[PDB]
Design a protein around this ligand. Structure first.
Ligand SMILES: *[C@@H]1O[C@H](CO)[C@@H](O[C@@H]2O[C@H](CO)[C@@H](O[C@@H]3O[C@H](CO[C@H]4O[C@H](CO)[C@@H](O)[C@H](O[C@H]5O[C@H](CO)[C@@H](O)[C@H](O)[C@@H]5O[C@H]5O[C@H](CO)[C@@H](O)[C@H](O)[C@@H]5O)[C@@H]4O)[C@@H](O)[C@H](O[C@H]4O[C@H](CO)[C@@H](O)[C@H](O)[C@@H]4O[C@H]4O[C@H](CO)[C@@H](O)[C@H](O)[C@@H]4O)[C@@H]3O)[C@H](O)[C@H]2NC(C)=O)[C@H](O)[C@H]1NC(C)=O
Ligand SMILES: Cc1cc(OCc2ccccn2)c(C(C)(C)C)cc1Cl
Ligand SMILES: [Ca+2]
Ligand SMILES: [Ca+2]
Ligand SMILES: [Cl-]
Ligand code: NA
Ligand code: NA
Ligand SMILES: [Zn+2]
Length: 805
């Protein structure tokens, strides 16, 4: 119950929400059916529309009008936004030359430049170039301010997941808004776009910007705008708030537009009907900027023009139906559309089986336009698993496609021509970023970055300390003229041991054999030096990685590679090696096929053993430093040390072997040398974070050798490829991956074919940021370079996407 017969007199768009059943006058009241009786009359005035005209200039104040043209309007803070232009011979903001804003130019009483977030729904990244002729206000912001060619949304590329990620700096798995539709088994409650449950606070995790601001003494405008409040009224409300007294005035504001998304769904992303919504958004920006200029805030406010996701062409006829794959379709619930999430219709049905559902959905038709996954097998870059609201079974749907349960779902609901929600690497899902103001740089283009980073920056813009989040604070310092955050490198927690020769061959009973007892004072001094780290400057180019947790490990040097060997996990945490453009690929000689050699620097008790692999009929082994890339027949023996061995399923070895034999050399050729760091990852609870030893669910049979869930590689070279990787004087270039360590290649539908037809495609799918690997390993890379730390932070957040331009 709301006693809706109090009054909004003097209270229109109050910043604090009053306790029901007192009636409300805030921008959320419409949504709760709780506004006072007179809300429309007082708060949603429309009389005479939104613009001053020649005849209204210096009129007599009529408090019924939507906005005012009377002489007193400036100090009342409620002029139409074009008041000065029509009535005082001023120019529109867009017609003014842009001039560098070197310092904030703010009215007295402003403690800090306000931040206005101008968010646009469905604003695909290529609209900036393609709609440029019809968006002059946006184009001035873009060319005069700081902009990226595009900004990567999070997965799924839907509205609430992305807007709440902008507000929190968190992945959807962590903030809890994991889709536009959801069931939470702990609450036993559902979340839907339509309706009221979505307003319950238990859905919304983390700490959004407006709470961060409030807790820290910075006042915030409201971020949610009820759909029936027109855009002109949202702008005028922001401008009115900006005229509040210093103690009452918020420092952060948000505008939101439903367009161009609303139209994009109906007409497709480039439908001829799309020009008009883009014009109208631009006019709204015009209104805000003219409004700010009138208030003398146009060189004071920092403005962020940001989208939540793009929009792709999608029609009813490009729909895959689960009824064409499954016989048991009625025993499942599907969250449908541009992604699929499957669960059992009833938890009383113990006959339901996820294994048989996956297999029935796997590679069944030649052009199948979705791929099933257990959530933990999704590309790690999606960060889409560690939440109970995310179903165990997931369908990644091809761009341009939908998945539905039965055909009747689609024609008893062609309506739409656009949709979004796909993999966040997809070009059509990329959205926009522009920052304009005293705190942003002038006429500066920055590289594409992910929207998870913006929360930190908006905190910097407001002098707030960000709550813990998934951004890498400092990675966006190059966007900013001032207020940069000066991060320090994390301290190393465990220092390595540097073992020398401490064990005789006969102390090892590992069941390993090697054909290696084949016999110089020149090359004996030489080999000792390699074992002491003589070539380390060649293979370890950026310093050794720091281990940021408590553990026991050894550094091991070799002619061709260096490793950090964990005495706890019995394998390297990392292995580093550099392959020059000129390097040669050789094969594993016949006499060395099954060779594994004890490492006399490392105790038998801290070593793997060959017998375990023999006994484990499912599990084989591979090497981190590939024997194929050995520098000489004698150095090749190093690659067969038991300390370079890792557990690998035979199916995975097909992947790994092609990577090491073919692709490393290809990249070295193309990139002019590469430095490679490879290692295991253990993430059995799929939280994106390094497992402790007591979290490991699988071991090589009858041993304490833990089985990785993934293998990573970080591949670094000179950004200026005219310099070799090992002699690079400037910025670096990186690509990385996190490959799932799986006992089958069911993920790759063409896997019966030659590795050259499928392997590289799989690696691309599992592309990753160095930062993702850091989370998963507790290592910190690039500790010793000649580059600035903020620059290295940007490099560690880089994702190589393998999309075209
Ligand atoms: C992206 O950035 C985020 C933010 O930094 C990273 O997430 C953090 O990760 C931390 C480590 O996993 C985690 O710390 C834990 O917090 C527990 C307290 O949690 C509450 O308080 C915080 C702070 O206000 C709050 O944010 C949490 O909110 C979660 O839960 C509510 C409702 O459940 C949701 O509304 C909300 O969306 C959020 O959900 C997300 O997080 C939880 C996990 O916390 C997931 O389950 C969800 O799926 C979802 O993703 C909480 O309300 C604290 O209790 C933990 O401490 C245990 O573990 C330590 C290990 O040191 C142990 O020593 C302690 O004793 C304790 O163990 C006991 O509990 C165990 C588990 O029940 C039990 O097995 C033991 O035997 C013990 O009894 C822990 O410290 C932190 O909560 C989140 N923060 C957020 C916002 O998610 C994230 O990792 C980053 N991602 C990547 C890839 O880097
Ligand atoms: C800029 C912005 C706006 C916004 O909400 C705007 C909105 C969306 C849908 C319907 C009505 N209003 C939000 C949420 C989290 C959704 C409150 C976050 C941000 Cl960062
Ligand atoms: Ca949206
Ligand atoms: Ca983990
Ligand atoms: Cl969804
Ligand atoms: Na085996
Ligand atoms: Na296959
Ligand atoms: Zn949409």
């Amino acid at each position: 119950w709301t006693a809706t017969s109090g009054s909004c007199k003097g209270r229109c768009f109050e910043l604090q929400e009053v306790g029901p059943p007192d009636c409300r006058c805030d921008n959320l009241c419409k949504s709760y059916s709780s506004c006072c009786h007179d809300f429309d009359e007082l708060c949603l005035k429309t009389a005479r529309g939104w613009e001053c005209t020649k005849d209204r200039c210096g009129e007599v104040r009529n408090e019924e009008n939507a906005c005012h043209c009377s002489e007193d309007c400036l100090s009342r803070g409620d002029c139409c936004t074009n008041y000065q232009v029509v009535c005082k011979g001023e120019s529109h903001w867009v017609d003014d030359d842009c001039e560098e804003i070197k310092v904030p130019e703010c009215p007295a009483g402003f403690v800090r430049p306000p931040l206005i977030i101008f968010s646009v729904d469905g604003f695909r990244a290529s609209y900036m170039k393609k709609g440029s002729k019809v968006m002059p206000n946006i184009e001035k912001l873009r060319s005069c301010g700081t902009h990226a060619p595009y900004m990567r949304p999070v997965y799924p590329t839907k509205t609430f997941p992305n807007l709440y990620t902008l507000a929190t700096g968190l992945y959807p798995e962590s903030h809890g808004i994991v889709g536009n539709s959801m069931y939470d088994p702990v609450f036993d409650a559902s979340f839907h776009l339509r309706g009221r449950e979505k307003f319950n606070h238990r859905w919304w995790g983390g700490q959004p910007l407006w709470i961060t601001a409030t807790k820290q003494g910075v006042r915030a405008g409201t971020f949610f705008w009820s759909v029936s409040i027109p855009h002109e009224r949202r702008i005028l409300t922001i401008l009115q708030w900006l005229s509040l007294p210093d103690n009452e005035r918020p420092s952060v504001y948000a505008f939101y537009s439903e367009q161009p998304d609303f139209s994009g769904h109906k007409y497709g992303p480039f439908g001829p009907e799309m020009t008009n919504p883009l014009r109208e958004i631009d006019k709204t920006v015009g209104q805000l900027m003219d409004g700010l200029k009138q208030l003398r805030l146009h060189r004071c406010v920092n403005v962020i023009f940001v989208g939540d996701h793009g929009m792709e062409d999608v029609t009813c006829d490009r729909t895959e139906f689960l009824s064409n794959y499954l016989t048991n379709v009625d025993d499942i619930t599907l969250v449908p559309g541009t992604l699929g999430r499957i669960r059992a219709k009833s938890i009383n049905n113990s006959k339901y089986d996820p294994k048989t559902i996956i297999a029935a959905l796997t590679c069944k038709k030649p052009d199948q336009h979705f791929k099933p996954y257990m959530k933990q097998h999704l590309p790690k870059r999606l960060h889409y698993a560690n939440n109970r609201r995310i179903e165990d079974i997931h369908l990644l749907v091809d761009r341009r496609w939908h998945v539905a349960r039965k055909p009747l779902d689609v024609y008893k609901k062609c309506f739409f021509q656009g949709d979004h929600g796909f993999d966040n690497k997809v070009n059509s899902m990329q959205t926009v970023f522009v920052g304009y103001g005293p705190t942003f740089k002038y006429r500066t283009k920055v590289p594409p970055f992910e929207n998870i980073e913006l929360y930190n920056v908006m905190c910097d813009l407001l002098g707030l300390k960000p709550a813990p989040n998934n951004g890498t604070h400092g990675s966006l310092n190059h966007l900013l003229r001032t207020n940069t955050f000066r991060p320090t490198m994390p301290d190393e927690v465990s220092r390595p041991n540097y073992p020398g020769i401490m064990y005789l061959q006969s102390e090892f009973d590992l069941g390993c054999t090697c054909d290696d007892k084949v016999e110089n004072k020149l090359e004996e001094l030489n080999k000792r030096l390699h074992t002491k780290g003589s070539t380390k400057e060649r293979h370890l180019l950026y310093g050794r990685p720091a281990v940021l947790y408590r553990t026991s490990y050894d550094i091991l040097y070799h002619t061709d590679f260096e490793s950090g060997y964990s005495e706890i996990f019995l394998m390297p945490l990392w292995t580093s090696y550099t392959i020059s453009k000129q390097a040669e690929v050789s094969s594993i000689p016949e006499h060395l096929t099954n060779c594994v050699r004890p490492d006399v620097r490392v105790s038998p008790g801290f070593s793997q053993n060959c017998l375990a692999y023999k006994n484990d009929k499912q599990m084989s082994y591979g090497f981190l430093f590939p024997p194929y890339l050995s520098s000489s027949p004698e150095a090749k023996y190093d690659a067969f040390l038991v300390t370079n061995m890792v557990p690998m399923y035979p199916a995975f070895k097909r992947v790994w072997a092609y990577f090491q034999r073919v692709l490393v050399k290809k990249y070295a050729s193309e990139r002019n040398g590469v430095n490679v760091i490879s290692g295991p990852i253990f993430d059995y609870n799929y939280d994106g974070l390094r497992d402790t030893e007591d979290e490991i669910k699988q071991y090589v049979e009858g041993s304490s050798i833990p089985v990785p869930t993934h293998y990573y590689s970080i591949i670094t070279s000179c950004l200026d490829f005219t310099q070799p990787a090992d002699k690079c004087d400037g910025p670096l270039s990186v690509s990385s991956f996190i490959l799932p360590h799986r006992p089958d290649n069911d993920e790759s539908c063409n896997s019966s074919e030659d590795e050259s037809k499928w392997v590289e495609e799989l690696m691309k799918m599992h592309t990753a940021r160095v930062r993702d690997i850091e989370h998963l390993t507790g290592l910190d890379f690039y500790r010793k370079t000649s580059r600035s730390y903020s620059e290295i932070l940007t490099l560690k957040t880089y994702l190589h996407t393998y999309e075209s331009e």
